[PDB]
Ligand binder design. Structure first.
Ligand SMILES: CN1CCC(c2ccc(-c3ccc4c(c3)C(=O)N([C@@H](C(=O)Nc3nccs3)c3cc(F)ccc3O)C4)cc2)CC1
Ligand SMILES: CN1CCC(c2ccc(-c3ccc4c(c3)C(=O)N([C@@H](C(=O)Nc3nccs3)c3cc(F)ccc3O)C4)cc2)CC1
Ligand SMILES: */C=C/C(=O)Nc1cc(Nc2nccc(-c3cn(C)c4ccccc34)n2)c(OC)cc1N(C)CCN(C)C
Ligand SMILES: C=CC(=O)Nc1cc(Nc2nccc(-c3cn(C)c4ccccc34)n2)c(OC)cc1N(C)CCN(C)C
Lengths: 291, 291
């Protein structure tokens, strides 16, 4: 209700293209408050099409729900502008997404960051499950980095990412919170391989077959089997044998309490988490919300 | 101890001059974390005198206390860089200082902002008094605007003749009650929206006119209730001046009926923001807790 602000086109401008989503493009933009002199960096998503008083009504009423979330590991929709092209505005995460982050930082990611990222993603997904919100598009590209010690899940509930979807989602359009657990396992697979393309070299029209014959993503080199068994149980075809996000929070937390025991990274002992000094400095500059 | 980060000169640099004080220059600068690609805006104060490692320890020992404060209306020291000239790092407040703010928004400000700013400055000063920290240089230039609904006090802990209590001018005594005097001048600055106190009088003479009973005049928009409070901050007996806690209570009740205590032309179409615009401001700029 009061969590979604309706904007004018005059109080924000799109400045640089950051990327394409499925149904729209995301820009880096600037918010100019009315009667003010300051300019605040923001992220604007302009939708591919459809300005219709009628489609606006489902866009708005679902934007209200995406403005309702309150969790440190879930992004909140902040505003909307209902012109000819719908424009959506969120906070800009200056570090980008976890996917390009682990791809451009593959030689400096320690084990202790990866397991904490897995935990944080699970807390965000567990909160959405507690809010009865299905993500439907969880992937390393939809996990944003506020600080390297703080990731947030974005772009949930929007409803093709075939290589992330559960088989019941591929064959029968079923989207549950257990289907999201499947996409969570692929997301962990992306993190542990430092941004590899899942099922690389296999047409998306062919994934349903290989999953029915038992084929799964291979064990990442840095993962022990305790981590790989977790990923594989997120890919049981029976959805209720897949773990719950609540359980995934507990298990990855305990592995975070002994990181190099569960992830084997070359040179893992010269790369570590920030001290309280470095953490408090990050929070005072960029991350003042409670965590 | 772990709240003050020691920086290297390679991970931050100065970008633009924001203003000077007397102890040194303040710059707008950018922090680049080591091994990272993003650039985070900061405020850097360069100590314009070059100091020695012996003076550095006295600089450091007070920097730790300036990094120890935790209150929504007091700025916290975040970092320090100890080269030839010491550099000090805080959060950058993009709206600037309350002084230039009310000067550039003169008579576009309602009573409800003016009274809340008075409350917030008293809250910060009362927190400093509870920490047994004297400000010694309180003025509208040292009140930073994080957002228009949130101000913070900076540059405390250690000649502004026209702000000082009389015992500070004659006997250089600096108590929390001398800070109450300078608070009254600050409220005067806001209520005249950035006028020069005692404008046109040499500072070498302010002691004389204060012993003769002369004070700053009543601002046009102020009724006598608020002007009497300012006059009690300028009593020659230090223990007849009000306490900061009392100023919090007294300005708070006046804030609950602003148009009763300030008479501004057109005050009734300029209001405080709605929860929607406030939830929008904080999610972008002010994630800190606050009342
Ligand atoms: C006939 N036919 C036509 C179309 C109809 C339709 C209905 C609803 C939408 C809709 C509504 C709301 C959103 C989204 C989509 C969405 O993509 N949204 C993201 C988000 O915007 N991200 C951002 N990136 C950068 C800046 S804004 C998002 C942000 C966030 F903070 C939290 C969750 C979230 O999903 C929000 C579109 C089309 C359906 C029927
Ligand atoms: C002969 N000579 C030799 C050396 C001796 C000496 C001793 C102590 C200092 C010292 C130490 C610490 C600070 C300050 C000064 C100061 O000016 N500081 C502000 C502050 O940094 N402001 C900012 N603006 C923009 C970016 S940083 C500040 C920031 C904050 F967040 C909270 C309180 C505060 O006071 C902090 C300097 C010199 C004195 C005698
Ligand atoms: C991971 C892809 C990407 O482009 N990442 C990225 C993201 C930045 N910030 C940001 N903040 C909030 C929301 C998004 C966002 C949300 N969705 C659904 C997106 C889709 C596509 C792109 C971005 C999306 N992003 C960011 O801030 C500067 C930069 C950035 N990078 C690394 C791209 C480099 N360009 C500057 C060329
Ligand atoms: C009233 C002086 C002042 O504070 N000016 C100021 C400040 C900031 N940001 C900022 N953030 C933290 C600390 C300080 C700061 C602290 N001190 C002690 C200062 C002394 C002089 C100038 C600035 C400072 N300044 C800031 O962020 C962009 C902008 C301005 N300006 C008003 C510049 C003028 N603008 C209208 C173009």
């Amino acid at each position: 209700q009061a969590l979604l602000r309706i904007l004018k086109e005059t109080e924000f401008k799109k400045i640089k293209v950051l990327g394409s989503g499925a149904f729209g493009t995301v820009y880096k933009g600037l918010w100019i408050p009315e009667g003010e002199k300051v300019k605040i960096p923001v992220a604007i998503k302009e939708l591919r099409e459809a300005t219709s008083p009628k489609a606006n009504k489902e866009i708005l009423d679902e934007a209200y729900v995406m403005a309702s979330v309150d969790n440190p590991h879930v992004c909140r929709l902040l505003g909307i502008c209902l012109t000819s092209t719908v424009q959506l505005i969120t906070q800009l995460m200056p570090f980008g997404c976890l996917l390009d982050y682990v791809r451009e930082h593959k030689d400096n990611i320690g084990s202790q960051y990866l397991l904490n990222w897995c935990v944080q993603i699970a807390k965000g997904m567990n909160y959405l499950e507690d809010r009865r919100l299905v993500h439907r598009d969880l992937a390393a590209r939809n996990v944003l980095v506020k600080t390297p010690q703080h990731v947030k899940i974005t772009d949930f509930g929007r409803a093709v990412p075939i290589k992330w979807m559960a088989l019941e989602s591929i064959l029968h359009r079923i989207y549950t919170h257990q289907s999201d657990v499947w996409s969570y396992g692929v997301t962990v697979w992306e993190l542990m391989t430092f941004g590899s393309k899942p099922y690389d070299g296999i047409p998306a029209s062919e994934i349903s077959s290989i999953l029915e014959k038992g084929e799964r993503l291979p064990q990442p080199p840095i993962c022990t089997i305790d981590v790989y068994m977790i990923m594989r149980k997120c890919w049981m075809i029976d959805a209720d044998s897949r773990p719950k996000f609540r359980e995934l929070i507990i298990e990855f937390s305990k592995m975070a309490r002994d990181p190099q025991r569960y992830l084997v990274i070359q040179g893992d002992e010269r790369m570590h988490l920030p001290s309280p000094t470095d953490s408090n400095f990050y929070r005072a500059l960029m991350d003042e919300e409670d965590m």
